[PDB]
Design a protein around this ligand. Structure first.
Ligand SMILES: *[C@@H]1O[C@H](CO)[C@@H](O[C@@H]2O[C@H](CO)[C@@H](O)[C@H](O)[C@H]2NC(C)=O)[C@H](O)[C@H]1NC(C)=O
Ligand code: D3Z
Ligand code: NAG
Length: 238
């Protein structure tokens, strides 16, 4: 399986070290990104959903589509072949394409191909007893594992911020509520049409992106929302 690195491995971006299987570089800022899909709605009425996991450069720029030889058009089959049946079921629920279940495959392809291929510590050469596309399944598992720790809906709810047809919200309140589950670092908060829409939680990593220690880090982009009047539209509203 993937190589293990010491739990006291040096932190990506925050240290000056050479890229290896145990050091994420140049993609040392890892973004766990989420959606609030209300029109059309997907996922549970009381949960955000997964967008992805993205390696950014430490300056906020990023690479994309970093290895054509490891781009796939069969994610669902790769997961099935690896017996990751609970993961695939979970992805259907919590990593949906808003347009419908039949577009999930294209979306998962997109995320792996664009961004997974750019995580340097995921490459087959970082495995013992590597098997074909092992790192693809591990990536989907890792995104899910990190997402589970970042329950945006509940963090917002606990701070009195819940979806509403009438209520509107202040950016700083949203930011503080979410900063509370991310070591006091707020995510990027993204709005669409004045509605709460996207979240990017930034991390630096000790060790490998698979199984390493994800340390909550400062956002390299703040928000495109207005300071107030923010709508949090209810899912499945009618
Ligand atoms: C998913 O698609 C990939 C890419 O085509 C498949 O991997 C290739 O499999 C072919 C046919 O067995 C081999 O000849 C190639 O060498 C493989 N390419 C690589 C880069 O590994 C893969 O087998 C497919 N997986 C599933 C479960 O269908
Ligand atoms: C990131 C971009 O947003 C679109 N997008 C957004 C949400 C979603 O649930 N599915 C989806 O496909 C994609 O077409 C693309 O991956
Ligand atoms: C999945 O299970 C099949 C059948 O038992 C087996 O051939 C294969 O090695 C398994 N793959 C993984 C990665 O568990």
């Amino acid at each position: 399986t993937i190589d293990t690195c010491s739990s006291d491995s040096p932190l990506s971006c925050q240290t000056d070290n050479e890229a290896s299987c145990c050091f994420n570089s140049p993609g040392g800022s890892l973004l766990q990104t989420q959606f609030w899909d209300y029109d059309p709605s997907d996922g549970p009425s009381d949960s955000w959903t997964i967008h992805g996991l993205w390696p950014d450069n430490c300056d906020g720029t990023y690479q994309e589509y970093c290895d054509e030889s490891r781009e796939y058009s069969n994610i669902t089959s790769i997961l099935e072949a690896q017996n990751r049946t609970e993961l695939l079921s979970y992805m259907k629920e919590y990593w949906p394409d808003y347009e419908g279940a039949d577009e999930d495959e294209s979306f998962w392809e997109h995320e792996w191909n664009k961004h997974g291929t750019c995580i340097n510590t995921i490459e087959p050469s970082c495995y013992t007893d590597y098997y074909a596309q092992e790192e693809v399944g591990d990536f989907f598992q890792q995104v899910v594992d990190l997402f589970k720790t970042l329950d945006s809906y509940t963090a917002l709810s606990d701070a009195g911020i819940t979806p509403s047809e009438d209520a509107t919200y202040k950016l700083s309140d949203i930011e503080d509520a979410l900063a509370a589950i991310h070591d006091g670092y707020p995510p990027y908060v993204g709005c669409e049409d004045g509605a709460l829409s996207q979240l990017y939680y930034y991390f630096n990593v000790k060790g490998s992106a698979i199984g390493g220690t994800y340390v909550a880090s400062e956002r390299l982009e703040d928000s495109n929302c207005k300071d107030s009047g923010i709508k949090y539209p209810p899912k499945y509203s009618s």
